[PDB]
Amino acid sequence: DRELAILATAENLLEDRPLADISVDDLAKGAGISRPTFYFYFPSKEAVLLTLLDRVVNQADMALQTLAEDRENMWRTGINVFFETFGSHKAVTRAGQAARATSVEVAELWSTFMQKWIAYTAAVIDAERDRGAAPRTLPAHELATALNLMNERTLFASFAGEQPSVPEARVLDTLVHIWVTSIYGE
Amino acid sequence: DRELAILATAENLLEDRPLADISVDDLAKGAGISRPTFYFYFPSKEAVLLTLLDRVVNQADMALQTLAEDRENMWRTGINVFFETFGSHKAVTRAGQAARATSVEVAELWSTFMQKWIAYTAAVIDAERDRGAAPRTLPAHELATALNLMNERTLFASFAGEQPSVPEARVLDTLVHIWVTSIYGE
Numbered sequence: 606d607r608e609l610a611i612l613a614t615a616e617n618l619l620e621d622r623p624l625a626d627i628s629v630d631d632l633a634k635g636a637g638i639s640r641p642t643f644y645f646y647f648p649s650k651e652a653v654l655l656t657l658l659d660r661v662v663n664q665a666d667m668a669l670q671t672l673a674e675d676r677e678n679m680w681r682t683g684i685n686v687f688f689e690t691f692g693s694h695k696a697v698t699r700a701g702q703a704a705r706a707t708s709v710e711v712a713e714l715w716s717t718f719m720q721k722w723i724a725y726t727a728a729v730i731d732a733e734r735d736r737g738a739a740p741r742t743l744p745a746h747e748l749a750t751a752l753n754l755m756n757e758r759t760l761f762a763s764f765a766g767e768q769p770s771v772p773e774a775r776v777l778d779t780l781v782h783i784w785v786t787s788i789y790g791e
Numbered sequence: 792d793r794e795l796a797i798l799a800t801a802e803n804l805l806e807d808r809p810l811a812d813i814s815v816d817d818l819a820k821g822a823g824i825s826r827p828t829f830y831f832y833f834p835s836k837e838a839v840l841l842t843l844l845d846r847v848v849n850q851a852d853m854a855l856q857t858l859a860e861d862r863e864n865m866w867r868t869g870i871n872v873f874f875e876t877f878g879s880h881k882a883v884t885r886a887g888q889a890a891r892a893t894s895v896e897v898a899e900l901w902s903t904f905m906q907k908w909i910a911y912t913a914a915v916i917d918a919e920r921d922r923g924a925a926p927r928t929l930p931a932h933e934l935a936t937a938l939n940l941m942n943e944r945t946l947f948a949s950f951a952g953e954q955p956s957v958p959e960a961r962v963l964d965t966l967v968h969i970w971v972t973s974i975y976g977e
């Protein structure tokens with residue numbers, strides 16, 4: 606509604622600058638509403654970012670669910686959900702990652718979804734071991750945890766152009782290599 | 792001197808609480824000096840953390856240099872330098888990681904050492920490929936980047952007891968598995 610215009614404005618401004626340099630006034634002005642009208646839809650600019658991040662993590666989650674309904678290509682398509690979804694929302698991903706430090710709600714959102722994505726990873730590794738396609742090496746949930754944390758750090762360093770980082774055009778191939786060798790390697 | 796007592800005090804208090812809840816007064820009081828005497832040695836409590844982190848990253852770096860003067864055990868000993876060094880300084884590591892967001896000096900320190908550690912990793916992978924012990928798969932510097940970023944995120948999640956995290960007692964074996972399979976796996 607006006608809610609969607611507030612969310613579009615905040616995502617648009619986050620591309621230009623950090624949430625510290627965005628006023629509820631910029632957000633109201635972008636959405637064609639007054640400041641007190643903003644406060645009807647959101648308590649803070651921090652609450653706007655939480656909603657933007659909730660939409661992006663659920664978009665990734667729903668795409669992974671769709672997939673779940675050649676072993677290298679299987680993992681590549683799964684990693685690609687996160688590459689494309691977060692890569693299509695870099696400003697929100699970057700701001701949301703930074704807000705984990707200062708928002709308990711943002712930290713718990715991120716934590717909830719990582720636990721879900723790790724549990725799905727471990728379940729697929731377990732299924733691969735059960736069909737005899739993968740060796741019983743590390744505990745599957747521990748392997749999944751380290752690989753998902755690798756993806757989190759690597760994808761977000763690439764998207765931010767951090768030094769150091771894998772170039773964005775090389776990051777999917779890099780991560781697929783490490784997943785497939787670590788999951789199938791004896 | 793008095794400098795060492797300020798640094799010992801700050802590391803001691805960081806174990807109890809975050810740098811936000813430590814006053815220059817706590818630091819002065821711990822070191823048996825006055826507040827203005829503190830300002831003779833350090834401009835801010837933020838400068839104390841920068842020095843503490845510089846000492847820890849250089850301790851790791853010097854231990855790695857010592858090492859550099861069975862392939863699974865080679866990588867295990869190298870990863871162990873970082874596990875033991877950072878694991879022996881969890882309060883400083885945790886505070887230092889958080890300060891990357893709000894200190895350019897802390898972010899550039901961390902960046903400098905990651906670039907060095909990635910370049911050393913890539914050089915060892917290159918040497919392993921040159922002696923025919925490792926296959927020419929991914930670009931060595933891209934593989935090294937992702938593996939080092941994996942270690943950074945995984946070690947620091949374990950030490951902080953984040954949810955999710957690999958249990959501290961399982962994190963070295965977890966990371967050695969993923970390094971050896973990804974470096975030696977075809």
Ligand SMILES: O=C(CCC(F)(F)F)N1CCC(c2nc(-c3ccccc3)no2)CC1
Nearest residue numbers: 673679683684687722725726729753756757
């Ligand atoms: O990368 C992230 C999370 C990234 C983040 F958010 F930063 F951590 N992944 C988490 C989920 C992984 C997965 N794929 C499949 C699958 C199942 C069926 C068919 C195809 C694939 N199951 O689990 C892909 C990689």
Ligand SMILES: O=C(CCC(F)(F)F)N1CCC(c2nc(-c3ccccc3)no2)CC1
Nearest residue numbers: 859865869870873908911912915939942943
């Ligand atoms: O884990 C980190 C960095 C961790 C951080 F800081 F979080 F990123 N490592 C970076 C350095 C790696 C390495 N080991 C050896 C070696 C050489 C000779 C003999 C034995 C080992 N060469 O490179 C070990 C893992």
